[PDB]
Design a binder for these strands. Structure first.
Ligand SMILES: [K+]
Ligand SMILES: [K+]
Ligand SMILES: [K+]
Ligand SMILES: [K+]
Ligand SMILES: [K+]
Ligand SMILES: [K+]
Ligand SMILES: [K+]
Ligand SMILES: [K+]
Ligand SMILES: [K+]
Ligand SMILES: [K+]
Ligand SMILES: [K+]
Ligand SMILES: [K+]
Ligand SMILES: [K+]
Lengths: 182, 83, 58, 125, 74, 108, 48
RNA sequence: ACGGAGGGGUACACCAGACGUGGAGUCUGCGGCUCAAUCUGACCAACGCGCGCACCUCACCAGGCCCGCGCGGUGGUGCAUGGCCGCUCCCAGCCCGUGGCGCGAGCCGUGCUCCAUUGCGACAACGAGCGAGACCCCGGCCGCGGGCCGCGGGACGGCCCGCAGCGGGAGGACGGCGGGGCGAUAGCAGGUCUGUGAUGCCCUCCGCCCUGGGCCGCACGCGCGCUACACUGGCGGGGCCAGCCGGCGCCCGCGAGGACGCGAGCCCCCGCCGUGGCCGGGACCGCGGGCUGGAACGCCCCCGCGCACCAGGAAUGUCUUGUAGGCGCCCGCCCCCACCGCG
């Protein structure tokens, strides 16, 4: 039995991710890895404040190192951008079209956004804005597609938003469908 | 205003110019894991420290997480007579 | 299987018009000249190629 | 030195053949005395000193693994010859399972029923 | 003499790690599994989620740094 | 060897070649609802247990390993039927009789 | 003052939400099936 | 949309069969009744469903502490909402750019075949995408490597016959690969605020805890199941084989069950009983002995007591290979305990 140790490592990695999703919302959290914790984030320059005081305070709130990479393409990640839609709440059409446009310039090959809540007159409906090509079936869904959903604590009722980004082009494996013949 | 020693040990788990940080498991042993005064003595006062803003909090899986401010550390300067 | 999708057939056309010379009316050999991101996909496209050859001869 | 295997469902039979034992109990003393015939079929339709170790599954599978092992272990006796080519022919004209293993295995259970096809009764009232 | 136990959940990472340790130089797989009703409450067709998790040993009775890999020596 | 003769002959012809009183008012287990009937059964059980030991030449068998060797079902209970073990005192005592290491016992 | 929490019983609740009911303790997961679905994904449990 | 309208397809929906269910006792859920409370949801797609009720879990009842002896709330509102789920549907469908027709709602794009809007080929339409397929997982046969695990090969409607493809043969481990995972657009005033630091708006300050009880009460009608109704059987002694992975020696004690320590059932063989509610069937009850636990009302074991039941009306369900069915084992909730569910 060498596996209690590793399983508790997994559950504590879940801990650190969810805590970071509660807290580092200010600085575009994405994800973290456990090893010496190495963190995928959207700007490190604030998570390290002046004189690293806050970063050290966090490390010592992981007792009761921390080193951080950079998200090179901000708009490809369905997490900091769904936080962006959290921020913009300002008209729905324009908010979600900016949400799409940033991803499409950043290099998404498909993108779309779903919104549901009491938008007009005491009734929930569901908007769906969209741009480009998307897929939803089989194993490649878990590689190339990316989904993220967020609750919003509105003045009136809660607002659910989903951002879905499709990248069939990464530096990696080739889709079983596309067979470039030359 | 219950126990002056209790309400000083709870501050003692704050390194003032250093960077310790506090967490709280809210059982509601029966003593804390940090020093050994009771969870209850920690919890009653930490409500007030939240109201004042000597410290701020987030929360994740039944576990209070705190972090110390500028103004709160100023407040503690005089309660521990440091410089 | 029975029916081949247009992905397979679209492949088979370009492949055979590009290697009319190299292709024989057998399957083992035609595999090499097709050797796509999967080996079963390879298998199916080569299966259609092996038929296109003995259909273009006659 | 000769190696041979035999399979039925989860039954694995190992045979060392050299110029007859099944689980240390000789041929005609293996438990199912009715299926003893079924075991002894190849020997009489077609010695050396063979030796077997077999486990897995149940009685009938043990039988269909040891029998098939002994068939292969004397099929590999002569080499590169017309006997090497016609023994397997008499074995097939007895049963093709006397060479090639049977590939059937139980299909897994799926929720909402006791087995692989039986559901539970559907009552509207 | 020295004992090495090296463990990880992802077969690719584990195989890489054994491949890049011999660049220097029965405990089989078992699986951690659960089944559980898909829905929150108890209404509708009884469908089930079946979760699964295999994790591996590699044994090195000795006579790269990969995050998610676990090592003990004893 | 002994293997070259069958067991259903060995047990009987060896009980015919061989003694507590708890033999009376005892069933062979909580499975069996009646005590056995052929009052030679204690000789027969003893010959069985020794025919089962001499098989195991190297490793040490045990007495729970022997009650688990002699098991059957429990029924008349309205429920799906479960397998139960036999008694322990009987087999331990038969082993002690036939006895005159690290664990259990062994042959010779 | 001398009655508050006398009784002894299992203190079994989920570690993520706080539900007294329907907690898995296999392997020592100490969590509930509802909570399990939205956090098992990265604790590691996957579907095949 | 629908038609007791025509035409073309298809599925265990029917055919041919098999195994059942409805008739008995029994476990479990629902109603209705009773109650200080018997907390509550849901009526194909509610009803072994909301993961195992002595205490806690508990939302409900009889009492009692805190702040006998703003804040919290398992309060409401799923017809105020988010996410997850079910279902229409695992159906084969959905839809864009430029052009054409029309005042416009709109239309166009969108025979031969396959499991399939899969394709052939034709066309005021040309050209793309999703869903389908591909993909992932498991399991069959064969190689190199390590010491079974982990890296690759192999199967394709390929061969030979008869008329995009329907047929017949051959070889091979497997023949048209097999069991599963995932799953389009559009939605339904299904279900779920009682799973959560999801939550708007109302009401309570109904918060937390302590003891005792109830949810398990019972003429009664439902549903899912378990053991039967025997001779293709029951009983007594013996033989011996699994897989999902897994501790057992010394003893005591009829047994169950204690104190101390260390690393499979069917089936087969041989006998008995002899068509008799019999030795089928094992409910209901009367003593004892044990385990859990602060606490038995929970569970085991020993003797005795031997109910109903003779194959079940009107009705009704499921299934094509290691499949139905028979046999048993294991994991979940779990102080103890499976008749349940996942295997
Ligand atoms: K249900
Ligand atoms: K149900
Ligand atoms: K109570
Ligand atoms: K025209
Ligand atoms: K017009
Ligand atoms: K159209
Ligand atoms: K047309
Ligand atoms: K047309
Ligand atoms: K036209
Ligand atoms: K290896
Ligand atoms: K390996
Ligand atoms: K909810
Ligand atoms: K209150």
């Amino acid at each position: 039995v060498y596996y209690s140790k590793y399983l508790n490592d997994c559950i504590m990695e879940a801990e650190l991710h969810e805590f970071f999703s509660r807290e580092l919302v200010d600085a575009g959290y994405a994800s973290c890895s456990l090893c010496c914790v190495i963190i995928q984030c959207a700007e490190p320059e604030v998570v390290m404040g002046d004189n690293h005081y806050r970063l050290h305070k966090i490390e010592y709130l992981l007792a009761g190192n921390i080193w951080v990479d950079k998200i090179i393409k901000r708009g490809l990640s369905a997490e900091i951008m769904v936080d962006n839609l959290r921020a913009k709440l300002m008209p729905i059409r324009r908010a979600a079209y900016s949400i799409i446009r940033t991803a499409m310039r950043a290099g998404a090959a498909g993108c779309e956004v779903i919104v549901a809540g009491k938008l007009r007159a005491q009734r929930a409906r569901a908007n769906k804005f969209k741009e480009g090509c998307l897929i939803s079936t089989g194993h490649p869904k878990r590689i190339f597609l990316a989904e993220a959903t967020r609750h919003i604590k509105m003045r009136q009722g809660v607002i659910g938003v989903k951002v879905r980004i499709y990248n069939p082009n990464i530096r990696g494996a080739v889709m079983p469908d596309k067979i470039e013949i030359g | 205003m219950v126990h002056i020693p209790k309400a000083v040990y709870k501050a003692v788990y704050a390194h003032l110019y250093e960077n310790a940080s506090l967490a709280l498991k809210e059982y509601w042993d029966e003593n804390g894991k940090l020093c050994n005064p009771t969870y209850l003595h920690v919890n009653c006062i930490m409500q007030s420290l939240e109201s004042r803003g000597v410290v701020k909090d987030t929360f994740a899986w039944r576990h209070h997480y705190y972090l110390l401010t500028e103004k709160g550390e100023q407040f503690i300067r005089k309660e521990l007579d440091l410089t | 299987g029975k029916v081949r999708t247009k992905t397979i057939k679209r492949a088979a056309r370009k492949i055979v018009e590009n290697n009319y010379e190299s292709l024989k009316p057998k399957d083992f050999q035609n595999n090499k000249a097709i050797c796509i991101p999967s080996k079963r996909l390879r298998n199916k496209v080569a299966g259609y190629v092996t038929t296109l050859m003995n259909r273009v001869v006659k | 030195t000769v190696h041979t295997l035999g399979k039925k469902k989860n039954s694995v039979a190992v045979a060392f053949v050299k110029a007859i034992l099944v689980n240390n109990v000789p041929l005609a003393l293996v438990r199912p005395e009715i299926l003893r015939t079924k075991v002894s079929e190849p020997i009489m339709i077609l010695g050396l000193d063979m030796n077997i170790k077999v486990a897995g599954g149940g009685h009938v599978s043990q039988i269909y693994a040891v029998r098939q092992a002994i068939s292969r272990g004397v099929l590999a006796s002569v080499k590169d010859e017309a006997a090497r080519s016609e023994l397997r022919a008499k074995l097939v004209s007895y049963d093709r399972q006397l060479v090639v293993s049977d590939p059937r295995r139980c299909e897994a259970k799926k929720f909402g029923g006791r087995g692989a096809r039986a559901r539970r009764q559907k009552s509207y009232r | 003499k020295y004992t090495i136990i090296v463990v990880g959940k992802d077969l690719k990472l584990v195989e890489r790690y054994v491949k890049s340790i011999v660049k220097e130089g029965r405990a089989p797989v078992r699986r951690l599994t659960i089944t559980t009703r898909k829905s929150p409450c108890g209404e509708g067709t009884n469908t089930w989620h079946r979760f699964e998790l295999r994790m591996y040993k590699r044994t090195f009775w000795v006579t790269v740094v990969i995050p998610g890999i676990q090592v003990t020596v004893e | 060897s002994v293997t070259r003769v069958p067991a259903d002959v060995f047990i009987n012809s060896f009980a015919a070649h061989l003694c507590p009183a708890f033999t009376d008012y005892v069933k062979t287990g909580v499975s069996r609802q009646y005590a056995p009937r052929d009052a030679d059964w204690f000789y027969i059980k003893a010959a069985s247990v020794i025919r089962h030991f001499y098989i195991s030449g190297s490793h040490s068998i045990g007495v729970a390993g022997l009650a688990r060797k002699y098991s059957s079902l429990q029924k008349g209970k309205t429920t799906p039927h479960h397998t139960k073990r036999a008694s322990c005192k009987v087999i331990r005592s038969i082993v002690s009789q036939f006895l005159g290491g690290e664990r259990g016992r062994h042959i010779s | 003052e001398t009655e508050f929490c006398t009784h002894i019983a299992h203190k079994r609740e989920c570690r993520i939400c706080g539900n007294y009911n329907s907690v898995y303790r296999k392997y020592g997961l100490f969590i509930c099936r509802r909570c399990f679905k939205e956090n098992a994904g990265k604790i590691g449990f996957v579907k095949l």
